[PDB]
Scaffold this active site. Structure first.
Site, mmCIF file in Angstrom:
data_model
loop_
_atom_site.group_PDB
_atom_site.id
_atom_site.type_symbol
_atom_site.label_atom_id
_atom_site.label_comp_id
_atom_site.label_asym_id
_atom_site.label_seq_id
_atom_site.Cartn_x
_atom_site.Cartn_y
_atom_site.Cartn_z
ATOM 1 C CD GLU A 149 44.042 40.995 49.648
ATOM 2 O OE1 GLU A 149 44.670 41.789 50.594
ATOM 3 O OE2 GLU A 149 45.062 40.346 49.158
ATOM 4 C CD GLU A 260 44.962 41.344 44.827
ATOM 5 O OE1 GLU A 260 46.066 41.443 45.836
ATOM 6 O OE2 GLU A 260 43.956 42.079 44.850
#
Ligand SMILES: [Mg+2]
Ligand SMILES: [Mg+2]
EC number: 3.2.1.4
Length: 329
Positions: A149, A260
């Site tokens: 991320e 994810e």
């Protein structure tokens, strides 16, 4: 008849990591049962065995803090204890025949500083990956998850950093393995093309000039703000993210993995997650897999828990895993 890889995140080596790239190493809670000798840390390896044997899963992602692996020595050698402990989880995953994603859970940052953009230098980061690649060079089922991320970074500079990492991994002898290419906006599948990450990362190549085994790595949640912090789901992400992405991937002959995704163990998510997964499975030429968040050291109280429950040598899955992620067919 579906994406190649289905699995889950086995979390814990990343507990203590926040979105600024600060990982407090004293706060890790690794999913290795006998991590300290108490023999009652979370049983990540036992979970994985259940997932593989009962739920037809073939991949696991193993989040870990950068600071943990080098014991807070930026640019230093991997800490012998840390890598020894983490490798136990890696080998447990590999022993099951699964692919295993090594995920540096650092948001492109070290203690608030952006890699290559005021924080660590590219060399201090490639040094981490060069060592991991050297360790894992001979194990083709280790998947190199460059960074979890990235957000609010310069995407042009980040892509260069990513290129330096890919070069380091290949030069260290890890030539057979998959490598993730993560983009901006918290890796959101919805923003991947529009924020310029797709284009910038498309320029990354292996030393031989190919893009072989370089897979775009995206994330996507199903709640109202794409944060994965609410139980309820409000979207299946098809129109807003995965349809446009599939088209782009297919035209460019490239592939992506969703490392994810997750939701509450509630009806709204059972519906939306199953729609999402079905669409990925119907586009398995461009999507290589999906990985749920999260199991490992998460317990029954975590809002997005996917941790199975052990009861007398039997495991029971959460409703979202059982109904949507698992492949018992
Ligand atoms: Mg079992
Ligand atoms: Mg966003």
């Amino acid at each position: 008849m579906g994406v190649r890889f289905a699995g889950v995140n086995i979390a814990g080596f990343d507990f203590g990591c926040t979105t600024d790239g600060t990982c407090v190493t004293s706060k890790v809670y690794p999913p290795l049962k006998n991590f300290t000798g108490s023999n009652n840390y979370p049983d990540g390896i036992g979970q994985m065995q259940h997932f593989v044997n009962e739920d037809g899963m073939t991949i696991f992602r193993l989040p870990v803090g950068w600071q943990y692996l080098v014991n807070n020595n930026l640019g230093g050698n991997l800490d012998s204890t840390s890598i020894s402990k983490y490798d136990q989880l890696v080998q447990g995953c590999l022993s099951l025949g699964a692919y295993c994603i090594v995920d540096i859970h650092n948001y492109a940052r070290w203690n608030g500083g952006i890699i290559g953009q005021g924080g660590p230098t590219n060399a201090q980061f490639t040094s981490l990956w060069s060592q991991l690649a050297s360790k894992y060079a001979s194990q083709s089922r280790v998947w190199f998850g460059i960074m979890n991320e990235p957000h609010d970074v310069n995407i042009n500079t980040w892509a260069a950093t990513v290129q330096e990492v890919v070069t380091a991994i290949r030069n260290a002898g890890a030539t057979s393995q998959f490598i993730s290419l993560p983009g901006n906006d918290w890796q959101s599948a919805g923003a991947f093309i529009s924020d310029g990450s797709a284009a910038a990362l498309s320029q990354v190549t292996n030393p031989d000039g190919s893009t072989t085994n370089l897979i775009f790595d995206v994330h996507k949640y199903l709640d109202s703000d794409n944060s994965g912090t609410h139980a309820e789901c409000t979207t299946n992400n098809i129109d807003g993210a995965f349809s446009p992405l599939a088209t782009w991937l297919r035209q460019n002959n490239r592939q992506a993995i969703l490392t994810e995704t997750g939701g509450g163990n509630v009806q709204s998510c059972i519906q939306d997650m199953c729609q999402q997964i079905q669409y990925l499975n119907q586009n398995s030429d461009v999507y290589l897999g999906y990985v749920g968040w999260g199991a490992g050291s998460f317990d029954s109280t975590y809002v997005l828990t996917e941790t199975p429950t052990s009861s007398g040598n039997s495991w029971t899955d959460t409703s979202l895993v059982s109904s949507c992620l698992a492949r018992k067919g």
